[PDB]
């Protein structure tokens, strides 16, 4: 089937709340090798965020039960966590590999580079949420490095209010708080991204102000939450 057809199929699936269909469409769009339009890119991101999002949220519930069952109830909770875990790594591996094979190498301008490097940071972060063993310290560092190169490219080539820059700070700050357990570096990162953007509310535009201001609000809420 052809790109534009697959895109419209993705939009139907989205509308129907059938995100596995939505991801399958956009995966196969990506696999055609062309650079993704940015409507397309957004669709890929929404499908995969909702697909791992369900798993992440089931993982957390069943993990919570596991840690708090003290029988053969724990054996059953463990096996179910692990089954959920494996689906979830299959979702992140899939995105991760589409990012390495098509999306990061096809990225021509700074914007897309930041977008995808961010996404690579996120999906490693989701793997990190769920990793035990020797696995972990390597997954983390993979995440940290995707974020970090993303961050540098954004501080140099995007405005403080670009929603994609602001979003990277927000998620990079979450990585610091939640993965690296460095609350102080997390607050400093969020607070500076909030302040620099707030000093330029003018320069926002009509295509971006809703997204940029909403992310700014979340930087602040996280700030409030982490100072408690």
């Amino acid at each position: 089937m052809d790109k534009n057809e697959l895109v419209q199929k993705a939009k139907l699936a989205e509308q129907a709340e059938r995100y596995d269909d939505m991801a399958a469409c956009m995966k196969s769009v990506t696999e055609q090798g062309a650079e993704l339009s940015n409507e397309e890119r957004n669709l890929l991101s929404v499908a995969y965020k909702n697909v791992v999002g369900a798993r992440r949220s089931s993982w957390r519930v069943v993990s919570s039960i596991e840690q708090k069952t003290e029988e053969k109830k724990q054996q059953m909770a463990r096996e179910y966590r692990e089954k959920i875990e494996t689906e979830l790594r299959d979702i992140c591996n899939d995105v991760l590999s589409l990012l390495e094979k098509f999306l990061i190498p096809n990225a021509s301008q700074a914007e897309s580079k930041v977008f995808y490097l961010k996404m690579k940071g996120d999906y490693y972060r989701y793997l990190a949420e769920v990793a035990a063993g020797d696995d972990k310290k390597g997954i983390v560092d993979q995440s940290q490095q995707a974020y970090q190169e993303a961050f540098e490219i954004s501080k140099k080539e995007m405005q403080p209010t670009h929603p994609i820059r602001l979003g990277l700070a927000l998620n990079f700050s979450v990585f610091y708080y939640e993965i690296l357990n460095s609350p102080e570096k997390a607050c400093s990162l969020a607070k500076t991204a909030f302040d620099e953007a707030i000093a330029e509310l003018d320069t926002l535009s009509e295509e971006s102000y809703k997204d940029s201001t909403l992310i700014m609000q979340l930087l602040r809420d996280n700030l409030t939450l982490w100072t408690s």
């Binding site: 991101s45 909702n50 996120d122 929603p163 927000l170 998620n171 909403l214 979340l218 996280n222």
Partner: peptide
Amino acid sequence: RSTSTPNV
């Protein structure tokens, strides 16, 4: 629980 970037 922290909040990350939502969908647009």
